[PDB]
Amino acid sequence: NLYFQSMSVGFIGAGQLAFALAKGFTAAGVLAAHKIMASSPDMDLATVSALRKMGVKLTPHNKETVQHSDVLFLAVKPHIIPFILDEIGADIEDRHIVVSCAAGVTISSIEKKLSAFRPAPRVIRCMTNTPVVVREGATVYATGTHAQVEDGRLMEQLLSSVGFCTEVEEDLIDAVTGLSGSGPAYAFTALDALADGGVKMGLPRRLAVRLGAQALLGAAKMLLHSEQHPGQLKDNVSSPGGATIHALHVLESGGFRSLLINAVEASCIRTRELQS
């Protein structure tokens, strides 16, 4: 409570992630909308329109966002980050916690750019995902060289208000991107395809969408609340000779498992490329 009581948050970038976080934070009750500020070069964006309706102060100047924020989220594409650290770098102060959300961008790279201005910049690296908008995000963070003990603690409480959150070593964050960072996109693909199959077999599309989504939600919650291995839960619900085991067979015949492994791998490797 005392963490967020006298806390101001700014977003460099008013894109998809910034709206999701701002929307998650306000819905959780941790931050008030008017106490949040975002800067965007293009105010013609859709997210920039939705954020204004929320009551989020918007500005074109990143230097304005830096001046009126304590915790500063960097929610821009990785290639813009060094151009932004050169723009607002002289405005970073001792009180700023800089939370980097750009994929791939290492703590070392941010600290190197900001250490040329003030010596001990407090930096945290973050991999979250869009379901923070419904407070069911998956977030990890690593603390940088000069982050104080309370800084990790403040970050953990804030990000926990909108989903799962835990600290990791920074070298795991590329892998987390490929799993839970890109994860929701795999799920949306899967739901579109599952609804298509429902439609093929005679269901109205709207019902097929709803039923597929409820199935995934329930199965994930079930796994999260179980002590049990995913395979054991698969085994429990697969009756001998039944419909479900017949469907699992056709998933196995297309190498379904290898495609998800391929996906996690390809997103992680792309994240490593964007750093280098």
DSSP lists the bridge partners of residue 163 as 137
Rg (CA), the chain: 21
User: Which x/- pattern, by CB under 8 A, does the window 219-248 give for a second copy?
Assistant: xxxxxxx--xxxxxxxxxxxxxxxxxxxxx
Report the partner that residue 109 touches, choosing among a second copy, ligand ZRI, none (CB closer than 5 to 8 A by kind): none
Candidate list 48, 72, 76, 101; residue touching ligand ZRI; CB under 6 A: 101
> Should residue 95 be labelled a site residue for a second copy when binding is judged by CB under 8 A?
no
Q: Cβ of residue 249: shortest distance to ligand ZRI, in angstroms?
A: 11
> Should residue 50 be labelled a site residue for a second copy when binding is judged by CB under 8 A?
no
| 262-265 long-range Cβ contacts below 8 angstroms, 24+ apart | 263/178, 263/182, 263/186, 264/175, 264/178, 264/179, 264/182, 265/178
Candidate list 98, 103, 126, 154; residue touching a second copy; CB under 8 A: 103
Using H for helix, E for strand and C for coil, what is the string for 16-42? HHHHHHHHHHHHHCCCCHHHEEEECCC
Instruction: Give me 50's structure tokens.
Output: 């939705």
Nearer to a second copy, 24 or 89 (CB): 24
> Should residue 167 be labelled a site residue for a second copy when binding is judged by CB under 8 A?
no
Nearer to ligand ZRI, 17 or 123 (CB): 17
Residues in region 117-156 near ligand ZRI by CB under 6 A: 127-129
Burial of 149 (0-12, 13-18, 19+ CB in 10 A): exposed
Candidate list 48, 105, 159, 208; residue touching a second copy; CB under 8 A: 208
Nearer to ligand ZRI, 119 or 241 (CB): 241
Report the partner that residue 80 touches, choosing among a second copy, ligand ZRI, none (CB closer than 5 to 8 A by kind): none
DSSP lists the bridge partners of residue 106 as none
Distance CA 218, CA 192 (A): 17
Q: Cβ of residue 121: shortest distance to a second copy, in angstroms?
A: 25
